[PDB]
């Protein structure tokens, strides 16, 4: 498996599942850790001898036929398939094995079937006594025991090779909301700001725009393929206009270049001025605000347009 997405989360809800057995690999974070290659397995083995696939254990099947990695990059994954291969009269079709030469190194896939000697009697091309055939029949019936009925044992193995991204999880996705301060993660472009549709002549191979001084402002949607602007929403300093703690205590809070539409109310070029009455009189500039507007204390805080003379 390479250049794919191995939907492990789907694999947790794909078929009948009985026994989870993991060793060395976390069973809950398979999607997050992207792997390189997966060599899938499918055991057809009675549950009596399945438990032998581990270091420090021996068996006619675990250490002879097809060996799982010692550093288990995966899980010992075994399920039940009692309703797959049951027939009346005894399913004597599948193949047993009697004996082999000796202990084998990990990952030894056997294909040849060289004749084996049991004692002092040599075979030399003779099959029979002390030279056994490598095949014997199974037994499967709808009336046989559950343990001796076939099991669907699909063991999954992983690899951490030094290769480009070839295997990982789906990670799912969410919906899009516009004109609100949200947190976005578009294939790594993490940030906060206001998302709104824009008309920018994006080239087909170009994903996300960027203005001077490396400030990303436009990103293409990975699904709808639309051009969306990016801008951080309103922020700015907060100033307090007071006549001093010797005549009164009323104050007017000014939010610098923050629009009054978002959190009396007066809108200026310097920002929204909350807590000051707007009057059309014109006197000397008492408390300077900006852009030709500056407030003063009369019997409240009132913002003028300063009179030159």
């Amino acid at each position: 498996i390479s250049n794919c997405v191995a939907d492990y989360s789907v694999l947790y809800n794909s078929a009948s599942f009985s026994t989870f057995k993991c060793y060395g690999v976390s069973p809950t974070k398979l999607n997050d850790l992207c792997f390189t290659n997966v060599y899938a397995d499918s055991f057809v083995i009675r549950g009596d001898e399945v438990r032998q696939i581990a270091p420090g254990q021996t068996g006619k099947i675990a250490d002879y036929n097809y060996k799982l990695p010692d550093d288990f990059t995966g899980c010992v994954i075994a399920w039940n398939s009692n309703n797959l291969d049951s027939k009346v009269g005894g399913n004597y079709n599948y193949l047993y094995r009697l004996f082999r030469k000796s202990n084998l190194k990990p990952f030894e896939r056997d294909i040849s079937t060289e004749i084996y000697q049991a004692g002092s009697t040599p075979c030399n091309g003779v099959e029979g006594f002390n030279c056994y055939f490598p095949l014997q029949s199974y037994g499967f019936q709808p009336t046989n025991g559950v343990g001796y009925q076939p099991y669907r044992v699909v063991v999954l193995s992983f690899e951490l090779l030094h290769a480009p991204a070839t295997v990982c999880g789906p990670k799912k996705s969410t919906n899009l909301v516009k004109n609100k301060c949200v947190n976005f993660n578009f294939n790594g472009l993490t940030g906060t700001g206001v998302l709104t549709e824009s008309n920018k002549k994006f080239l087909p191979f170009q994903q996300f725009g960027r203005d001077i001084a490396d400030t990303t402002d436009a990103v293409r949607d990975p699904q709808t393929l639309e051009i969306l602007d990016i801008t951080p929403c309103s922020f700015g300093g907060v100033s307090v206009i007071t006549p001093g703690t010797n005549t009164s205590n009323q104050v007017a809070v000014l939010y610098q270049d923050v629009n009054c539409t978002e959190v009396n109310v007066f809108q200026t070029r310097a920002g929204c001025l909350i807590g000051a009455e707007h009057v059309n009189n014109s006197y000397e500039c008492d408390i300077p605000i900006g852009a030709g507007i500056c407030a003063s204390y009369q019997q409240s805080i009132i913002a003028y347009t300063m009179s030159l003379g």
Epitope: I111, S112, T113, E127, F133, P134, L135
Partner: nanobody, 116 residues
């Protein structure tokens, strides 16, 4: 098809029958071969199998009339079934690389047989 079989026909109950399918290269028969047939109204019934050396195991249910001859230079193998009964009006198949898996075997076409 790259695998053809010769044999069959209308035979009185009790006759003999044979099937011939052959290959060309020495290494094409690695490593497992077997035979199978699908009678109408009958499920799969595997009979026998053998490796390159020729060691054979046969399904004990119907293991009484099994006889097979094998060749290497001609790159052939024959499943001989005798005593043709009245329950063999079906199609047969011989398979190369039988055990290799779901996508590692190649199938055939067979010939029609009439039995009374």
């Amino acid at each position: 098809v790259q695998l053809v079989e010769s044999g069959g026909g209308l035979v009185q109950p009790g006759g003999s029958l044979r099937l011939s399918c052959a290959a060309s290269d020495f290494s094409f028969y690695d490593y497992e071969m077997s035979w199978v047939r699908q009678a109408p109204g009958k499920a799969l019934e595997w009979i026998g199998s053998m490796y390159h050396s020729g060691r054979t195991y046969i399904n004990p249910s119907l293991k009484s009339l099994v006889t097979i001859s094998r060749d290497n230079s001609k790159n052939t193998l024959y499943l001989q079934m005798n005593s043709l009964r009245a329950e063999d009006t079906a199609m047969y198949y011989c398979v190369s690389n039988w055990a290799s898996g779901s996508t590692g075997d190649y199938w055939g076409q067979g010939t029609l047989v009439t039995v009374s």
